[PDB]
Amino acid sequence: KMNMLKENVDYIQKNQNLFK
């Protein structure tokens, strides 16, 4: 379980901030 470490912490910030 060593992929959704930085990707999970980027997904929560992607929902609220929306950096597309």
From TrEMBL:
This is p101/acidic basic repeat antigen. It comes from Plasmodium falciparum (malaria parasite P. falciparum). The lineage of its organism: Eukaryota, Sar, Alveolata, Apicomplexa, Aconoidasida. The gene is ABRA.
